[PDB]
């Protein structure tokens, strides 16, 4: 049973060598598939490791998934900060009062840098201070003409 | 020392077979753990590779991490573009002047499609062109009555 | 050829043991590289598996890439929802009419909580209902003075 024992040792060694060649190929296949699922140019190195992906987020490049996710989180944070800024400063429709509200930090506020509205019976343009001042000037002139009328009348009222 | 040498060859072969069965199981365990850390339904294929994850971002499905990160970057980009649009077009509080500003691209601008404000001593409603026109009409009528008064007065002024 | 056959069996076994030690080290190197490319503190466990990353997105922690991507998708969704809210409610520049528009859901709308505008010949401040009411009161007083003038005139008109 000695030459027989050698015969089978050589055959079992042959099966082991086949397993090793199959295992070596399983490892690079695994490695390749992982590189594929990472994307961003991840590839398999000559030594069997997965070379780093290159992920572009914003103006930066990230060599791992966590750093990219973090960068996306920060971008969304910054965009939310801009949105909250707009929301604090925008002249907004207020549903509770059915109107746009020029309230700011609890106070009625001005609107300024407003160009003059068309004055017509069907104009829906807002009007400004310059336009109302011209009306106020007309009114003051009307009152002076009236005071002149009251005096001219008074003179003839006594002179009779 | 010949049968002894066989005895140990069979024992060393037995240790190698145990190592191979342990290595085969290490590879599928590694593979499984990688599938778990990727998520998105990644699983281990019969051949030992990691099947692709399916990541939903927006209206698309992405089969690798890089393509998903890219898609998230583009969504945030698009949302920032909407925000910048709002910021260019919104009627905004200007802290430097303590007031909302109807400035647009450096010019005083109109506000139009404005419904008529309540006219009362405590109204904080904006007023429109139609409302100011009605005032201007009243003023023109007042001036004609005054001119009629000046003439009636003049007639009696000479006729004495 | 029997002792020779043993000589080479021991040498082929020696090459196989070297391959196994090289393969064991390839697996932990692969594992390490995958842990590195995942980031978020992913590390290699004693058993050769990749321990889970810890990815922070918003106020949550996610133990796999898919769940993190999902969380980033939901955050961007929520930020877009805020932006669309602003866009529906903001008083906006309308390029088609070259003016800010106080239109809301197809209707001319009020602006209220507006503080009084400066009345001067170069004021670009919007004016409110309280300011226009004071003008209307002045006008009513002017008309009563005129009616008094018409009566005083009429009396002297007949009395001659």
Curated annotation (Swiss-Prot), chains A, B, C:
More about this protein: Immunization of mice with folded, full-length, purified SadA elicits an IgG response which provides limited protection against bacterial challenge.
Record's protein name: Autotransporter adhesin SadA
Notes on the domains: The signal peptide, cleaved at the inner membrane, guides the autotransporter protein to the periplasmic space. Then, insertion of the C-terminal translocator domain in the outer membrane forms a hydrophilic pore for the translocation of the passenger domain to the bacterial cell surface. The surface exposed region contains four YadA-like head domains and extended stalk regions, multiply segmented by FGG, HANS, DALL and neck motifs.
Subcellular location(s) per record: Cell surface; Cell outer membrane
UniProt source species: Salmonella typhimurium (strain LT2 / SGSC1412 / ATCC 700720)
Subunit note: Homotrimer.
Role: Involved in cell aggregation, biofilm formation, and adhesion to human intestinal epithelial cells.
Cystine pairs: none
Similarity comment text for this entry: Belongs to the autotransporter-2 (AT-2) (TC 1.B.40) family.
Description of the deletion phenotype: In vitro, loss of sadA does not affect cell aggregation, biofilm formation and adhesion to epithelial cells. Disruption does not affect the course of infection.
Source lineage: Bacteria, Pseudomonadati, Pseudomonadota, Gammaproteobacteria, Enterobacterales
